[PDB]
Amino acid sequence: DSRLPAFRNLSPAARLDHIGQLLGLSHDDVSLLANAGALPMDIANGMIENVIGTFELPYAVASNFQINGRDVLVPLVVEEPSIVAAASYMAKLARANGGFTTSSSAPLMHAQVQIVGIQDPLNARLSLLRRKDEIIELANRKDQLLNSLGGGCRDIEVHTFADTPRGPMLVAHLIVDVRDAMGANTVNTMAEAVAPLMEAITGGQVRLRILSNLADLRLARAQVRITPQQLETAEFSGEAVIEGILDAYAFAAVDPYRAATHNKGIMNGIDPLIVATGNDWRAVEAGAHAYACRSGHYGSLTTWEKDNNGHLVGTLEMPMPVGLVGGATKTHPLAQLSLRILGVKTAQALAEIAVAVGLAQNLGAMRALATEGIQRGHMALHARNIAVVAGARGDEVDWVARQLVEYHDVRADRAVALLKQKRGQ
Template sequence: MGSVETGKSSRISGFHKLSPADRLKLVQGFAGLDAAAAGHLAQPALDPHLADHMIENVVSAISIPIGVATNMKVDGRDLLVPMATEESSVVAAVCNAARQCYDAGGFTTSVSGTEMIAQIQLVQVADPQAARIRILERKTEIAEICNACDPVLVKLGGGFRDVEVRVIATQGGPMVITHLIVDTRDAMGANTVNTMAEKLAPSIERWGSGKVYLRILSNLADRRLARARATWPLEAIGGAAVRDGMLAAYHFADADPYRAATHNKGIMNGVSAIVLATGNDTRAVEAGAHAYAARNGHYGSLTTWEVAADGGLSGTLELPMPVGLVGGATKVHPTAQACLKILGVQSAADLARIIAAVGLAQNFSALKALATTGIQSGHMALHAQNVAIAAGATGEEVARVAAVLVERKAVRQDVAETVLRELRGKA
């Protein structure tokens, strides 16, 4: 997986203490970034001309910080992982979780494939069960119509794979739903499968003797799953009491949807940060993940946690991961391209596997914090700098005000404003 030179370690001591410029130099050397990519990351401006062609009615662009998670070892390869997020403690959480399982081998990952689903909705059908069979009988013709939409994809080894037809009961009566199963390879594939569904719709109407309305992909990409697993030794996490507290937190999340929503949001803190950094569709990934968490009729945890044979903590994560390396913003946005170079991935499957590993790491850190010091301790210590800046602190004032806020355990803007006035009064 990937082309980044082997033998390099992601265990970079004191990385968080360096200046942004010095961190970037280390990342450039680790990933072999060229001067253009490094220069863009140092001054991450988006060309107005490019922005104007990415979306409509453009007036400006917003910058989100990109941090780099260290200590990540995925399938035996050391990685530096770029993460785009506005939330404090997310990147640090991944670094800490990865460090604690690094010596145990890090993360092992896999994917189920790169297949996406397009749905074609057929209504006003007199004989829905017979229509289902009539459509299934046309599999060869369906394959020809779909593959003709994208000969390049077929040449690359992708294209139509299978057809499924379901009859579902709805408030408006029975509907015949055709699923096109398409291997989109290194593309996320939305445009490809949507085109195929639209091209096929008139034929579905004719074969099924009904009316087609919707023809669009499904974001519940359960044929495109990414999986990650890791084991944290007992001594690395602080003993059996911490392990058991983490298991209790997981059991709570898996049983209660109110807890599971926040539990899974924490997982997506890590997942969405890489999806965004690489120019992929965060909304598609998030929608698919949360739908997958409810696939059994109950919304629960995306992760599973168990006691390993040696007494350590074993964690796994499985979720849909429709991401790509080609098409959309991933291909045209210079920051996304630089982030992909840092990861050194060669396929969409490689990227999906890394994202799953980061999601599992994120969940580990959240569960450990909840089972020990509480989630606010580390998070608010990092968030204090944001509060200090919001209160008007600049330069060295930021760290000084933040330190006082943490010491007083009052990370609030009104307190920060008071502390800042006191500091400036003494000065």
């Protein structure tokens, strides 16, 4: 059961006790989070190069999430407030209608084998296509362990660029079926093995043999349904909020400026889940924004419609190059424990959850922005950080300043003013 009552009122330690009993975590697992230093310097020094210490970030747990009828706790690591509060509130609403319905495609990654110096790119392209099975088998022979797990190179698609500054070039794509692995290193290795053979055929000089972060073959999808009666507030009507959201969606669909902020909100929920599981967050961001820019126009990643039934329906489909047997994933003690809380068995399981959180996150920001400003809920949480920006000396009184300025007028302009009300006359 993901629903966690009065969880936000529980102290950090009390919450960890609750999550421990629920999940049935060992006392060894609970200590990794209770006691600082879960990451030993010898391990930390192994990942990065010039390691001198370790940097910490809050590690939270969102709730109410239901992916395909199965409840699940979502661990997040971020520094910005409201993200978890929002993500959980929206997941709570989705519960009433069956939670989040997700899916995904076969984990297909692609390697790029760039070839320059060919005077006949177009003719050379066919030569590679006829000897496709020959190149495929060469790629698989490299990684035998992958073929046994059910993965392996599947097909090859060759593309050309005749009008190029540095001249025409041929770019072959190896469509590799990795799995439970982001597959960066696996695909990159296959591209190296094939390079020689492709030069033998096209007669050009292979340059780059790297993968592509724009994983448009490895998609993850998520769906939500929101009844107007659920969004119904005191000042606004249920159907009124739906239209507001729809106006906000259209806006993000036509204006790239709003789309960048709209897509940023989606990553506010996805990125923290990636950092927790020890996955590459930059790879995820790169595949996301580039995908939003596929139709020659930067736009929304999520869609918001109003079905003929009158309910708000949203979706999120985007590349999700995540893993389970990755590098820092098996290495970092907490990245390992995060997958244990999630209960994921495959990488695609992780991707389906990642898009669900993103979708939930976007709906939350939009609902807020369409109801009445964003400063009402975000600043209430951010009332602590901003208290530090004003409190010069004697940061003890910051706690009290936060409770006073929380009267719907929270801002540094007022935070500096409330200081005199206590320090003097």
